[PDB]
Write a protein that binds this ligand. Sequence first.
Ligand SMILES: Cc1nc[nH]c1CN1CCc2ccccc2C1
Length: 150
Amino acid sequence: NQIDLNVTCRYAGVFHVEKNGRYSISRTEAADLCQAFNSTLPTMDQMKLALSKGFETCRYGFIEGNVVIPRIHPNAICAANHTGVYILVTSNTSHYDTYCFNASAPPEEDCTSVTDLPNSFDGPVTITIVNRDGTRYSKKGEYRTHQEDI
Ligand SMILES: Cc1nc[nH]c1CN1CCc2ccccc2C1
């Protein structure tokens, strides 16, 4: 009974979270996940500031109201060579990654490891935070509040 959460550097408090390394987070689960990190889904303005500080990914993730990919460098296989905060317009499907925003993070780039899931609650799941440098933190708990997500 195990969940891996892959997390990125924070840029102006904004980071990317992927569950089990594949698109697998619903919009309701995304809200619960950010809450577990004492974070919220970012606004577009928050995401644009993160982009300006160096944030980019090659993965679709929820923000408040949209699914986006932040892009600095144009790449043919990431958001079809666009730069800026690329907004997903047309999709059949409902599961992506998420972005989260932590107001207590440093103002610019923070590439230190994430070491806790401070607001997870009591539960049976072994939840493992996995940093890009491979550093791991594990705890038993739960973050999902909606049954359709469990
Ligand atoms: C390349 C890729 N394919 C699916 N997801 C991804 C990006 N992931 C790859 C795995 C990973 C692990 C820890 C922190 C960040 C990431 C980013």
